[PDB]
Design a protein around this ligand. Sequence first.
Ligand SMILES: OC[C@H]1NNC[C@@H](O)[C@@H]1O
Ligand SMILES: [Ca+2]
Length: 438
Amino acid sequence: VKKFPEGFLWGVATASYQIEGSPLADGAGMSIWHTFSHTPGNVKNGDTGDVACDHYNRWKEDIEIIEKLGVKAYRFSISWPRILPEGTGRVNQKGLDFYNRIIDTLLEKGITPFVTIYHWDLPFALQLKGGWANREIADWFAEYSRVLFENFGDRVKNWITLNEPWVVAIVGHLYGVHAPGMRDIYVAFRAVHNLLRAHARAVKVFRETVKDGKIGIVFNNGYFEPASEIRAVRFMHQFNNYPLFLNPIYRGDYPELVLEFAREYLPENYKDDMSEIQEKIDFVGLNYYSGHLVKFDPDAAKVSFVERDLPKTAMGWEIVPEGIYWILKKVKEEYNPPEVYITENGAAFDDVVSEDGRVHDQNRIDYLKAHIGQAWKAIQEGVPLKGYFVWSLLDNFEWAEGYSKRFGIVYVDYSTQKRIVKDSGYWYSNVVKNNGLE
Ligand SMILES: OC[C@H]1NNC[C@@H](O)[C@@H]1O
Ligand SMILES: [Ca+2]
């Protein structure tokens, strides 16, 4: 037996652009993911979020799936351009209506909503004004967040400002692999800094508007091990993991090795913003998927990855369950946040529907079991983990990989939009019902 604390929150997670489709329905503005995916060469197979899982129409069915599995929490995100089509100013009631219905339905069914305010679908109108590169986005984001709090804060009490701000800044503005598809290191570090400022403004407004909820922020994390008997592992953790952001929030500056690498790229007077960035948060959400062997490498960031002969997912990600334990221990050790959630953990496998009508994803059961087991351990050793969210409820649009990578515990047949609960979803429901592993 590995039984979790009473009231531990078992969840599933999605994001608006990955599942919804109908990006321009009911007066919604374009997002940067709409324009990025409609640009040839950016996304595998020319795939876009035009239809995705058609959750925009099938939302009731999908929630009924969450209910039927007995899953206790649903992490989903709100499309900023459905709410404010030009990013600021005008509010679109039909956009609010869409999320109102989802929210009321969840509550009616006893499911706890966790709302991600920003999961990467920036209004295109704001991107024309520089998007995350423009300091003014702290204001635009604060106004957007205020609208959400005023409309939904009576019912939704668990909020996340940003999903994976490292990805948004670095994959979006340095690697150019995600919207808005830029490759400029100075822009990417200004986006890091402005993501922090916007995050802190939204928390500040949250305290003024929703005096009963909790708000936090979500980071991607890798488990970095050194290829030999070091500092490159230190750098990768500080740069790619929660410290890039938590060091400002908790300690009022960027991590030491980040400054060593990136000081020239930050605004000259960036410290002027740090006391505001220290706005108190209620919880930290950590996403975790993979471990990486890392070694120093002259002329790289001075770091390269070393391939290991370990089980991998369809992403090529090495399966390293101990990583989730490590990152949970490490966050308590470094910043001691009052609550932590695992806001995403999951895997992509080449799922197939058998002749029996089933999806026998034993590889995904094995992945989830092992990571839940390591999360359990962290809890036994004092980490205040309050919940765990499987990425994802549904197979969906996996960004620049398009539909070619399936992360769901529910299979989606894209030709018919049929949902087929996978073995891993059945398995997970039993875990939730039991409040743990057996
Ligand atoms: O790559 C898998 C997931 N990672 N975190 C954020 C999600 O949007 C991704 O699909
Ligand atoms: Ca289209």
